[PDB]
Each structure stands twice: as structure tokens, then as C-alpha cells.
Amino acid sequence: ESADLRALAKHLYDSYIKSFPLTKAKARAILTKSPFVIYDMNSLMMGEDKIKFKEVAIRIFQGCQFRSVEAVQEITEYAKSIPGFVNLDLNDQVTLLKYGVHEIIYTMLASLMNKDGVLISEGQGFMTREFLKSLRKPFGDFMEPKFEFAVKFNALELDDSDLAIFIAVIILSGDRPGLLNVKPIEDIQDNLLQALELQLKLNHPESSQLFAKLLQKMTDLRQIVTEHVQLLQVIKKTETDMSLHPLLQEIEKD
């Protein structure tokens, strides 16, 4: 019954709102109180006279990782609201979050990107794409593929009510390595898929095959994740004096 797929849609959209303070709709309002724009070395030092936040590239990287840690917490809180998620085997909950969290982070980061740059510090700042592309040789391309994905992902013009269902689908992937009870996970994702399909078809009636096109974006995400972790291993051996947050260290071990 369709009425049950709309209730699920509304439920998840409500929890997403409650779980993620910087929504896509607020980010689009900002990008179209305006942000401080960092674009070079000196605007970054200026950026602290107006914003409040050991070499530049490292420090930028550490900020990205700290907001990843913050994002992991919000995604975790959002997952608990997905009906059936908390009744799963505790080890699988951990597995679902372990392999889903990076895919969601870059899904939602696209909401804060345009082709020119990315919102930071809860939207108070805006770091341009080329300044990021210009950092020291390892870090200078840590954000570029995310920009590439974001530009194609944002072409679908999903809004938040769409992303809430989509993010739910990503968490509940039976595909993940080490899952003990694949079946009850898939039974939920199948119901989330049903909710998303009806959601896209109602929210974007003129956007044919958006559902299918959204599902194909699930391959670009996994590529972003992969080159991210290899990039992370290059840093760990190139920067033996730079630490990483253990919540992220524990999650990045696959």
C-alpha cells in the first residue's frame, strides 16, 4: 500500500531534519547571511578574524577529518531512526555503519558543494575548489574527486526528502562484508527502495528514470571511497607525525 510508503518517507525526512543541522536546502540558500570566502593563504588567516577554527594543508585536512567525525555521529543518530535498524544484530549495525558512513558523507557533502567550492564551518565559510586543488602534493587532490562526483550528483537535483530515503537505502546494504543476517537487512532495504521509488516519482514526476539514475550513482560513491582510503594510507606513511581520529581509524580498516 502506497500510504505506508509515504508515511515511511515522511518519518525519515523528519529524522533527517532532526539529525543533520546543515541541510541541502539551507546550503542552497547560503550558496545562492553570506559566507566568508577562503581562496588563498591570506584569506585563511583572515578567515579566523571573522570565523573561529603545523602547515596549512595538514590543518585543512584535519578540519575535513574532524567534520567527518562529526558527520559519523549525525549519520549514526539518523540510522537508529530507520525502522528495523536498531533491532538488527548489534554486530551488523556496526557493520552497516562501518561501510556506509563514508558513502553517506560524500553524498551529503555534495549538498554543500557547487562546481566552485564547498561550504565549511556550518556554512559560515566557503572554501574554493581551486585553493583546495592547490595544496601540498598529497593533499592537493583529496577533495577534487568529491567535487567531480558532486557536480554530477547534484545534476539530479535531489532535495532533502529524497536524500533521507536514499541515505537510508545506503546504510541498509546486505552487500557489506561480514554481515551475519543478510536477509532481514535486505527486507528493510527493499522497503526503503519501494519508498524511494514512489518518492522520486512523486517529487520529480517529470524526471524520468531518476530512481534508476540515482541507483547508478551508487557506483561513483564507492570509487570516491576507494581513492579516499588509498589517499589516507599515503598520508599515514608520508606524515608519520600527523595523527588521525580513532573513530575514523577504526572505521577505515577494510
User: In the 8-state DSSP scheme, what is residue 117?
Assistant: E
Q: Could you give the count of Cα atoms lying within 13 Å of 189 in the half-sphere of its Cβ?
A: 17
Which three cell numbers, joined as nine digits, stand for 47? 578567515
Write the CA distances from 131 to 39, 57, 60, 197, 245, integer angstroms.
5, 10, 11, 38, 24
For residue 135, the 8-state DSSP code is S
Beta-bridged to residue 119, according to DSSP, are: 126
Question: How many CB atoms lie under 10 A from the CB of residue 147?
Answer: 19
3-state secondary structure of 241: coil
Other Cβ atoms less than 10 A from the Cβ of 163: the count is 22
Is the Cβ–Cβ distance between 189 and 169 less than 8 Å?
Answer: yes
User: Which resolution in angstroms does this entry have?
Assistant: 2.3
Measure the CA–CA gap between 128 and 130, rounded to whole angstroms.
6
Q: Which residues contact 35 (CB under 8 A, 6 or more apart)?
A: 119, 123, 124, 125, 126
From the list 219, 220, 253, the residue with the least C-alpha distance to 236 is 253
Segment 21-25 long-range contacts (CB within 8 Å, at least 24 positions apart): 21/74, 21/122, 22/111, 22/112, 22/119, 22/122, 22/123, 23/111, 23/160, 24/108, 24/111, 24/158, 24/159, 24/160, 24/163, 25/159, 25/160
Distance CA 70, CA 19 (A): 11
DSSP-derived pairing of the beta strands 36-38 and 125-128? parallel
Query: Pairing between strand 117-120 and 125-128?
Result: antiparallel
Cβ 71 vs Cβ 103: under 8 Å: no
Distance of alpha carbon 108 from alpha carbon 71, whole angstroms = 9
The DSSP output letter for 239 is: -
Q: In what order do the strands lie in the sheet with 113-114?
A: 36-38, 125-128, 117-120, 113-114
For the record, the C-alpha cell of 204 comes out as 520529480
Unique residue bearing C-alpha cell 537510508? 168
Q: Are 113 and 154 in contact (CB under 8 A)?
A: yes
**Amino acid identity for residue 39 in this structure:** Y
Angstrom distance (rounded) from CA 165 to CA 16:
9
DSSP designation for 118: E
Q: What residue ranges do the domains of the chain occupy?
A: 1-254
